[PDB]
Design an enzyme around this catalytic site. Structure first.
Site, PDB file in Angstrom:
ATOM      1  N   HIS A  89       0.895  -1.196   0.000  1.00  0.00           N
ATOM      2  CA  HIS A  89       0.000   0.000   0.000  1.00  0.00           C
ATOM      3  C   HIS A  89       0.939   1.255   0.000  1.00  0.00           C
ATOM      4  CE1 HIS A  89      -1.164  -0.428   4.294  1.00  0.00           C
ATOM      5  NE2 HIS A  89      -1.268  -1.705   3.975  1.00  0.00           N
ATOM      6  N   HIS A 136       3.884   6.494   7.759  1.00  0.00           N
ATOM      7  CA  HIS A 136       3.906   6.110   6.362  1.00  0.00           C
ATOM      8  C   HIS A 136       3.457   7.322   5.570  1.00  0.00           C
ATOM      9  CE1 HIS A 136      -0.236   5.574   7.723  1.00  0.00           C
ATOM     10  NE2 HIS A 136      -0.540   6.016   6.515  1.00  0.00           N
ATOM     11  N   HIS A 160       1.402   8.850   1.794  1.00  0.00           N
ATOM     12  CA  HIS A 160       0.590   8.720   0.600  1.00  0.00           C
ATOM     13  C   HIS A 160       1.109   9.752  -0.382  1.00  0.00           C
ATOM     14  CE1 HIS A 160      -2.383   6.421   2.960  1.00  0.00           C
ATOM     15  NE2 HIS A 160      -1.948   7.195   3.939  1.00  0.00           N
ATOM     16  N   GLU A 191      -4.103  13.017   0.937  1.00  0.00           N
ATOM     17  CA  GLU A 191      -5.426  12.479   1.209  1.00  0.00           C
ATOM     18  C   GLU A 191      -6.343  13.598   1.672  1.00  0.00           C
ATOM     19  OE1 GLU A 191      -4.729   8.835   3.601  1.00  0.00           O
ATOM     20  OE2 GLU A 191      -5.115   7.941   1.628  1.00  0.00           O
ATOM     21  N   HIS A 213       1.647  10.417   7.551  1.00  0.00           N
ATOM     22  CA  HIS A 213       0.762  10.053   8.649  1.00  0.00           C
ATOM     23  C   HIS A 213       1.587   9.403   9.737  1.00  0.00           C
ATOM     24  CE1 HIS A 213      -2.928   9.825   5.821  1.00  0.00           C
ATOM     25  NE2 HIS A 213      -2.648  11.049   6.232  1.00  0.00           N
ATOM     26  N   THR A 234      -7.735   5.674   6.671  1.00  0.00           N
ATOM     27  CA  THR A 234      -7.965   5.928   5.260  1.00  0.00           C
ATOM     28  C   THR A 234      -7.649   4.738   4.382  1.00  0.00           C
ATOM     29  OG1 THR A 234      -5.770   6.760   4.721  1.00  0.00           O
ATOM     30  CG2 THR A 234      -7.368   8.317   5.675  1.00  0.00           C
ATOM     31  N   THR A 235      -7.187   3.636   4.953  1.00  0.00           N
ATOM     32  CA  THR A 235      -7.103   2.370   4.253  1.00  0.00           C
ATOM     33  C   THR A 235      -7.954   1.352   4.997  1.00  0.00           C
ATOM     34  OG1 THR A 235      -5.095   1.768   5.481  1.00  0.00           O
ATOM     35  CG2 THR A 235      -4.808   2.752   3.304  1.00  0.00           C
TER      36      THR A 235
HETATM   37  C1  LIG Z   1      -1.488  -0.101  13.067  1.00  0.00           C
HETATM   38  C2  LIG Z   1      -2.627  -0.230  12.061  1.00  0.00           C
HETATM   39  C3  LIG Z   1      -3.959  -0.395  12.792  1.00  0.00           C
HETATM   40  C4  LIG Z   1      -2.427  -1.423  11.129  1.00  0.00           C
HETATM   41  C5  LIG Z   1      -2.726   1.057  11.277  1.00  0.00           C
HETATM   42  O1  LIG Z   1      -2.064   2.005  11.498  1.00  0.00           O
HETATM   43  N1  LIG Z   1      -3.652   1.072  10.212  1.00  0.00           N
HETATM   44  C6  LIG Z   1      -3.830   2.280   9.509  1.00  0.00           C
HETATM   45  N2  LIG Z   1      -4.789   2.162   8.535  1.00  0.00           N
HETATM   46  N3  LIG Z   1      -4.973   3.540   7.872  1.00  0.00           N
HETATM   47  C7  LIG Z   1      -4.085   4.368   8.547  1.00  0.00           C
HETATM   48  S1  LIG Z   1      -4.084   6.047   7.997  1.00  0.00           S
HETATM   49  N4  LIG Z   1      -3.715   6.058   6.375  1.00  0.00           N
HETATM   50  O2  LIG Z   1      -5.412   6.602   8.240  1.00  0.00           O
HETATM   51  O3  LIG Z   1      -3.029   6.651   8.819  1.00  0.00           O
HETATM   52  S2  LIG Z   1      -3.207   3.721   9.698  1.00  0.00           S
HETATM   53 ZN   LIG Z   2      -2.148   7.052   5.899  1.00  0.00          ZN
END
Ligand SMILES: CC(C)(C)C(=O)Nc1nnc(S(N)(=O)=O)s1
Ligand SMILES: [Zn+2]
EC number: 4.2.1.1
Length: 257
Positions: free
Chosen positions: A61, A91, A93, A103, A116, A195-196
């Site tokens: 991703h 991470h 995007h 995003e 993020h 957001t994933t």
């Molecule tokens: C640790 C864990 C629950 C696997 C996680 O962090 N999942 C996320 N899923 N979307 C995220 S975002 N793009 O909103 O930061 S983080």
């Molecule tokens: Zn994110």
């Protein structure tokens, strides 16, 4: 399996994750004129001095840098938050071109990328439990624009060659995420979601107003990653962003006037 392509992208996610059409989905467009200054909002407390980064990983991703979250080491407090939130991972995007990739948007403006920093509320004991709570996670979102290089990002960029394809990871110790933060901690905040997938509605979003600048060379290295695993047809990991979702019954609050 879900992704960002024509047949598995964000417009398809609701079939496996019906909460995709929920009441507090993220990201959203931040309409700066409609966000209300909330004088009761505290300053954000970003305590990253004792952060312990562990690994950097291509998860198909995004790429993510993971931290030791077994102790209160790097924590987010204050702002709109009650209690202590432990940094688990960050991470990004990003886009195929500099005019898209974020995003969240700001008055419909898309940034080249969005960082993020994902934190979880220690009152829930572990991140898996926290995801099941409406205040389980706090994600600090930081926009990236293309211009001057961000020196604090270069250590990340220089290892991406070693995690080109999904599943690859590398040791990534002693990385200081303070080098990714802009000067100002002025922010917008609203209740939202991951957001994933699984798109869980467990996130207090804290989106910084001030972007960081990264260089074209830095973002170009993001765009050389692959969605695919090694030996599969090469599909550049670009445009791994979910578009803005309906604000519905939510108010975005600003920490600043
Ligand atoms: C640790 C864990 C629950 C696997 C996680 O962090 N999942 C996320 N899923 N979307 C995220 S975002 N793009 O909103 O930061 S983080
Ligand atoms: Zn994110």
């Amino acid at each position: 399996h879900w992704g960002y392509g024509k047949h598995n992208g964000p417009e398809h996610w609701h079939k496996d994750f019906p909460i995709a059409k929920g009441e507090r989905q993220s990201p959203v467009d931040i309409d700066t004129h409609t966000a209300k200054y909330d004088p009761s909002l505290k300053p954000l407390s970003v305590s990253y001095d004792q952060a312990t980064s562990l690994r950097i990983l291509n998860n198909g991703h995004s790429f993510q840098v993971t931290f030791d979250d077994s102790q209160d080491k790097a924590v987010l407090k204050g702002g709109p938050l009650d209690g202590t939130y432990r940094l688990l991972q960050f991470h990004f995007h990003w886009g195929s071109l500099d005019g898209q990739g974020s995003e969240h948007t700001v008055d419909k403006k898309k940034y080249a990328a969005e960082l993020h920093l994902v934190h979880w509320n220690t009152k829930y004991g572990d991140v898996g439990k926290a995801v099941q709570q409406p205040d389980g996670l706090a994600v600090l979102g930081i926009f990236l624009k293309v211009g001057s290089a961000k020196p604090g990002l270069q250590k990340v960029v220089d290892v991406l060659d070693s995690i080109k394809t999904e599943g690859k990871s590398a040791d990534f110790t002693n990385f200081d995420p303070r080098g990714l933060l802009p000067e100002s901690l002025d922010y917008w905040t609203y209740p939202g979601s991951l957001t994933t997938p699984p798109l869980a509605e467990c996130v207090t979003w804290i989106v910084l107003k001030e972007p960081i600048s990264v260089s074209s060379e830095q973002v170009l290295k993001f765009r050389k990653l692959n969605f695919n695993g090694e030996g599969e047809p090469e599909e550049l990991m670009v445009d791994n962003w979910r578009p803005a979702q309906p604000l519905k019954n939510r108010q975005i609050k600003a920490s600043f006037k």
